[PDB]
Design a protein around this ligand. Structure first.
Ligand SMILES: [K+]
Lengths: 150, 21
């Protein structure tokens, strides 16, 4: 039963067990080779366990099937973590749909590129518009941008 | 290097899975 497998994936993900979620997702992918949600979860599992190149290889092996349901955030995130900042920037700017996750990464990418004026505008917006457990951290990031300008 | 947090990592999460049930 593939609904039963998905129930397993969800349970593991909610408990942060991406190692076991990956095993179950791979069983789903044996049944439905082009399930976009399964490929998306596989990418997340790999990123969560530090396997950024493996996650990127999944994305780039399934480009057509993932097109426009796509994981531009995850692809750019892996590129960012793999010291490919220029790739990461292009992936973000090429995304079909802009999201809060993409904007968060975009601020970090602009910081790494030393584009501090644009970075500051992004972080001011991120600080204002975000409601999450990371306001203190995000304001620390904003202060690092202000410091770099001076 | 000032302290700078990778907050993007906190966004790395499964999509909603209800429909897969
Ligand atoms: K982990």
């Amino acid at each position: 039963s593939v609904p039963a497998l998905w129930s397993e994936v969800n349970r593991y993900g909610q408990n942060g067990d991406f190692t076991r979620a990956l095993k179950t997702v791979n069983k789903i992918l044996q049944i439905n080779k082009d399930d976009v949600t399964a490929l998306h979860c596989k990418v997340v599992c790999l990123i969560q366990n530090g396997s950024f190149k493996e996650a990127l290889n999944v994305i780039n092996t399934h480009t057509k099937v993932l097109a426009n349901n796509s994981l531009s955030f995850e692809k750019a995130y892996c590129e960012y973590r793999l010291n490919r900042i220029e790739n990461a920037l292009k992936t973000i700017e090429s995304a079909n749909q802009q999201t809060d996750k993409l904007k968060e990464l975009y601020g970090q990418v602009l910081y790494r590129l030393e584009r501090y004026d644009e970075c500051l505008a992004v972080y001011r917006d991120l600080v204002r518009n975000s409601q999450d457990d990371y306001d203190e951290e995000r304001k620390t990031n904003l202060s690092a941008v202000v410091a770099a300008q001076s | 290097k000032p302290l700078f947090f990778d907050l993007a990592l906190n966004h790395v999460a499964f999509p909603p899975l209800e429909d897969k049930l």
